Structure formats: C-alpha cells, structure tokens
Amino acid sequence: SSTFVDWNGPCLRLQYPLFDIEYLRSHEIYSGTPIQSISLRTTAKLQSILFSNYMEEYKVDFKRSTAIYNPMSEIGKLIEYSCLVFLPSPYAEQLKETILPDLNASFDNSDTKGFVNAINLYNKMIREIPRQRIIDHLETIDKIPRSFIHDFLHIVYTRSIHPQANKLKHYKAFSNYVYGELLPNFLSDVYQQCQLKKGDTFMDLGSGVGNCVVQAALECGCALSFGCEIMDDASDLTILQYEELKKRCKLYGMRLNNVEFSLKKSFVDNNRVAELIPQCDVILVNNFLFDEDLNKKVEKILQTAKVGCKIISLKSLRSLTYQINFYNVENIFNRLKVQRYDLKEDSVSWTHSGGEYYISTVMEDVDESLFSPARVKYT
C-alpha cells in the first residue's frame, strides 16, 4: 500500500498570502484557458475543487508507455493534495478513507476501470461540499507540504515545456549555451539556506525556461523574481510556461508575485540586469558549463552586489587560488565568504549523484585570509 504523495514529507511555512481568499469568495466561475492534458501527445475528467464549472480530461492508459509524463500519476497527486491540503475536517476524512485506498490500488494494479471509478466517485463527493467550507479552510492554512509547489509546477511544466523539450537541445556550438536544469528539491534547499524571503529580490542569470524564477516567486513570495536568458527557444518556452502558470494559479486561488524576464538577450551589457544587481538578495547562476571568458563577464556583473547578497553557483566564482594582490584590490571577490556543499542525489539534470555547489555571501569587510603572508510513489 502506497500513496501518490509523501504524507510524511517536510512542510513549508507560508510566509506570504499564498491563497487569495477574497478572490475566491468573489469568483465562482473559471474562465481561464489552461492547456488540457488530454490535448498533449479511456478517459476521465477531474472536477475542479474550487470552480464548479471546471473539469479537465485526462487520457488513462496503463499500457501506452507512461513513465516521464504520467497522466494518472498527476491525478493521484491532485486528489491526494485535496485530502491533504484543500479539505476541512470532515470531508477530508470521507475522501481519505472512501477514495484513496481504491485509487492507489487500482493504480498499482494497472486497473483502468477501478481507477476511473475512484475518480468519478471523487468528483461526486467533491460536488457535495459547500464551497464556502473549502474556502474558509484555505484561509486557515499556514503551512503546506514542500511537494505541493513542486507538483503544481510540474503540472505546468508537463503542459508547456515537455511537449517541445527537444527545442532546448539544438546543436550547441559553445558549452556556454548548453541547457542544464537545477531541480525543484535542490532549489527548495538552496532558497532556504539563503533565507530567500518575502520582499526580497531574486535573480537568475541564465534562466533557461524560468523554472528557478517561478519557484522562487511561489515558494518565497519575493517582491521580484527576475531571470535573463539568451536562447530563442528557451525564451519562447519561458513565455508559454509563464502563461500557463498564471492560469493554473487562478484555478487554485494562488497569488503569483511579480515575475519578470529579460528574454532573447545576453545578461552581459544588459541594462535591466545591471540596474537590478544592487538590490538582489539572492543571485543564482548555473555556471556549470560556463567557460573562463563568460565567468569573467559574470564576475564583472557581480561587482555591484550589496552586502548580505547571497550568490548560488555550481562552480566557485573565485579561483580556488585567488590571492589579493595589487590588480584586484577593489574586486567584490575580496569580501565574499565562500561555502562549498555536496550536491545531494538528483539535484541537477545532468547527473544522478556527486558534484557540489557554492553559496558566496557578500561581506562588509575584506577577508584577511586572502592577503599573502607578507523529472514515483511513496510509503
């Protein structure tokens, strides 16, 4: 017996108004146009928990592949999240005992008819709950499963990025533009280590399709989550994903703080990047495949960072043998505290295990030390 979500996972503390209660109380009809899963390439419709008029159709096939994007897996997670997060006692009980056991078994056994029956039973039960009870409950939530945002973002991702993922892997003349992804759990760990919080400014130099930027906004409520990406197709996919994300957020009454991108342009000699650096609290840069030249450019860009700013990277920013001399006396690298960490399993897309990452903090004074002596179920 297993669950679609880890009911024992870590819970995230909400440090900003994630659910817009007034919006929900004033909006009962969803008019958004989210990408329906069934449009990607037996069926069942999943009834929206908050909007009576919304239902999404999923293709249900335990034979036809599955794996990577698994429609049934998403449903299992959504239905469980209802029981875990969106329902008030008592209904959370009825749902928990009445649907989950059969939903999970039917799944594990590749039992189509049983799986669909559990879904249809889930829909019937959900429609019997007074809407205002669900909303009144959301209003009390102060903590949520760390996996919620991850799974919520994965849904958006399966809909907007996955279908055209191949466009992100076109022949790369330079390693500088090779696409690599930092994964959700790694991002969650690192944002926490840097204490990314409400009102902060977050920047991702080389944002890819925006995964790191949107996660920063959703899980920390940053005043501004910004990303710059130069590749054309990564940039188009960023727009599609961003668009789908806004619709899904509305479907769940979630607030999405300011998200901004500087697309199809270099972050080098980028005036918006330059004007934002000084106010950034956290700067992320996956320089794993960056060459010496580019790293030098990144170095230049970071010169105006403020005291306290934390920079996350996969390769140290400062040469391991960086010693203060006479040609680098004013470089911000001189007052940067560097801390190395081991990469946990499956933190990045290019490797299963191994590796490391760094968190460099901008300190007020210089470091004397530098002077010379003289993309699965649970139990």
Ligand X SMILES: Nc1ncnc2c1ncn2[C@@H]1O[C@H](CSCC[C@H](N)C(=O)O)[C@@H](O)[C@H]1O
Query: Residues in the site for ligand X, rule: CB under 6 A?
Result: 176-177, 179-182, 204, 206-208, 211-212, 228-231, 234, 266-268, 286, 294
Q: How far is the CB of 243 from ligand X (least distance, A)?
A: 18
User: 69 among the known binding-site residues?
Assistant: no
Task: Tell me the two tokens of residue 114.
Answer: 């049983």
Nearer to ligand X, 111 or 243 (CB): 243
Q: How far is the CB of 319 from ligand X (least distance, A)?
A: 20
State which amino acid sits at residue 21: I
**Angstrom distance (rounded) from CA 184 to CA 149:** 9
Q: How far is the CB of 76 from ligand X (least distance, A)?
A: 26
User: 267 among the known binding-site residues?
Assistant: yes
Sign for the pseudo-dihedral over CA of 338, 344, 349, 351: positive
**Angstrom distance (rounded) from CA 14 to CA 218:** 10
State which amino acid sits at residue 289: L
User: 203 among the known binding-site residues?
Assistant: yes
Task: Tell me the two tokens of residue 354.
Answer: 């191994």
User: 175 among the known binding-site residues?
Assistant: no
User: 74 among the known binding-site residues?
Assistant: no
Task: Tell me the two tokens of residue 191.
Answer: 């944002």
User: 204 among the known binding-site residues?
Assistant: yes
Q: How far is the CB of 107 from ligand X (least distance, A)?
A: 30
**Angstrom distance (rounded) from CA 155 to CA 257:** 19
Residue with tokens 């470091």: 367
Task: Tell me the two tokens of residue 305.
Answer: 């960072």
Nearer to ligand X, 82 or 160 (CB): 160
- Ordered DSSP codes for 42-103: -EEEEEPSS-TT-EEEEE--SSS--SSS-HHHHHHHHHHHIIIII--TTHHHHHHHHTHHHH
User: 209 among the known binding-site residues?
Assistant: yes
Q: How far is the CB of 263 from ligand X (least distance, A)?
A: 9
Nearer to ligand X, 100 or 216 (CB): 216
**Closest residue (Cβ) to ligand X?**
206
Nearer to ligand X, 197 or 375 (CB): 375
User: 202 among the known binding-site residues?
Assistant: yes
Nearer to ligand X, 177 or 341 (CB): 177
Phi, psi of 262 (to 5 degrees): -115, 100
User: 227 among the known binding-site residues?
Assistant: no
Nearer to ligand X, 229 or 244 (CB): 229
Q: How far is the CB of 352 from ligand X (least distance, A)?
A: 17
Q: How far is the CB of 168 from ligand X (least distance, A)?
A: 8
- Ordered DSSP codes for 275-319: HHGGG-SEEEE--TT--HHHHHHHHHHHTTPPTT-EEEESS-SS-
**Angstrom distance (rounded) from CA 131 to CA 327:** 67
Nearer to ligand X, 80 or 281 (CB): 281
**Angstrom distance (rounded) from CA 194 to CA 254:** 24
Residues annotated in a binding site for S-adenosyl-L-methionine: 179-182, 202-211, 229, 266-267
Residues annotated in a binding site: 179-182, 202-211, 229, 266-267
